[PDB]
Symmetry: C3
Subunit: 185 residues, 3 copies
């Protein structure tokens, strides 16, 4: 039982719903380094609207969003794009055998990254990165990660993927990106 | 938490770029053994660098925030960052008294030597890009350099610069993560 | 220090790109449980890649540094990095005896499988950019790939490439941090 890592497992079995049921594998590893969470992410789309991008055929298909919504205990909510079944603490290359009840130490800090309010909204709750479709260096897509900006939850981590190039028949499967964020406790 | 040095995560100004307390530098240094994991963002609230207009002022293109440390890793008062809230973490605040030693958080002097007559290698620099107002077409380059200031034993300096001609853009940024080799 | 594998942070050449010991690769791998936090830079000190001039040599645009490991995470001698120079950290140096096991520092084989007839995914790559001589208009792309080499159980490879036509630019770089999923 690895109590310092929450993850999706590193397999390639679809676990995520962007446009249709289980059309993608989000590989996400959150590793607790005390007051910071070290995060590693990639995405493989296997089917549906976002599997093969062709902006000559479909000029308006330019972005999509994957949302992780959490309750007061850091438990993933079922309206998240990521499925609950394989999001858990690590055991080897798999998960602990039972669903976790508490993971507050992995949640994004609410003082650093407040929910929307009357107070001025600051950009520090965002981290940008670039990943590469098919591993090709001339095929960038931007990954925008935002903390605690969704309603209907206590905490949230959202991944927005977008691209500016007019890609023709480019499969949406990405290289990996690492970032960190300030932990709630 | 003897393991995270930070500015606290509030938004109360703690930093002086062009005028007293014109900014909040949010900096979190977390010790992962031989490496420090660092997370940084900046909010400018007043003064010269608060609202950028490069049509009226085309030469306003960069500024520098310096953290200078003594032999014990204690922040020196001529740093741009204020001493009052730079300390080890306790909850969402700081431990109750100022720290005495943080050498384990300092940038490694063999990896990143102080200025001298010797060849200056670029490995003491890490570049990154952050975004003003969270807008993806509003980049600014954050250049971080280790141990290149004089009048101190260690230093971390952040140079912010931009090439776009911004028009009335508020200088408050997204976050960037990097790491560096620890002194011990 | 059983939590960091490194090259030491000195400037002594330890790597062979085009000719014997023509470079210092500074690589620090720090184990943060399930992830390895990695920090890398390169200084080329002699030979073909020391001073880039693409007017004189228009096709000199990339090179690769390979780390090949066996089943125990031990570095194999066909690697570009020399074995004498790679070990667990002790102070600013290395332990005096060669390590026997470092499987916990190897790239995860399920996350990053060896080449096969199965579909090849891009997640075994991480891109970054570093800067020659620390100048922001002198980028070179560092492409890091996990477990794609033959003749080993695990691998980490660094491919450096550039598109600009550099004229008399010394190949010594700023630093880049990334992470990867650990084997155990
Ligand atoms: Zn496909
Ligand atoms: Zn303002
Ligand atoms: Zn105008
Ligand atoms: Zn760590």
């Amino acid at each position: 039982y690895d109590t310092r890592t929450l993850w999706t497992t590193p397999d390639t079995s679809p676990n995520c719903t962007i446009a249709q049921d289980k059309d993608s594998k989000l590989t996400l590893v959150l590793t607790k380094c005390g007051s910071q969470i070290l995060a590693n992410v990639s995405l493989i789309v296997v089917a549906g609207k976002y599997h093969i991008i062709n902006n000559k055929t479909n000029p308006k298909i330019k972005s999509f969003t994957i949302k992780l919504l959490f309750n007061k205990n850091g438990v993933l909510l079922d309206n998240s794009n990521l499925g609950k079944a394989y999001w858990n603490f690590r055991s080897g290359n798999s998960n602990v055998s039972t669903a976790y009840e508490k993971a507050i130490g992995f949640m994004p800090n609410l003082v650093a990254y407040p929910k929307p309010s009357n107070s001025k909204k600051y950009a520090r709750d965002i981290v940008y990165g670039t990943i590469y479709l098919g591993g090709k260096p001339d095929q960038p897509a931007v990954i925008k990660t935002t903390f605690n900006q969704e309603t209907g939850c206590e905490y949230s981590i959202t991944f927005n993927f977008s691209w500016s190039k007019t890609y023709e028949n480019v499969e949406f499967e990405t290289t990996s990106f690492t970032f960190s964020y300030i932990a709630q406790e």
